[PDB]
């Protein structure tokens, strides 16, 4: 049970080291807030 647990915590390092995509739901929140501020600043350049 300890070797299976130690091996599984092993794979958590391998997943969180290897891919970029595993943290997608946090990066999506950071991206949406950055995209809304990019929009808000771009509207200052609009003539109306």
């Amino acid at each position: 049970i300890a070797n299976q647990f130690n091996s599984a915590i092993g794979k958590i390092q391998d997943s969180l080291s290897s891919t970029a995509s595993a943290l997608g739901k946090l990066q999506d929140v950071v991206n949406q807030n950055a995209q809304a501020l990019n929009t808000l600043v771009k509207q200052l350049s609009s003539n109306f």
């Binding site: 600043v41 771009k42 200052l44 350049s45």
Partner: protein, 48 residues
């Protein structure tokens, strides 16, 4: 290095003026930020 009302050629606003590391080519007279706002200026009486 002091807050100033600047008026370059009628391009006008308030800011602190600081020496650029921006290499403006001989044709360039204003600089523009990602925000689409003026962020650097070539002085009209000395080419700095």
């Amino acid at each position: 290095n002091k807050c100033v009302n600047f008026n370059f050629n009628g391009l006008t606003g308030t800011g602190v003026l600081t020496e650029s590391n921006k290499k403006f080519l001989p044709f360039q007279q204003f600089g523009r930020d990602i925000d689409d706002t003026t962020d650097a200026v070539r002085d009209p009486q000395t080419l700095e």
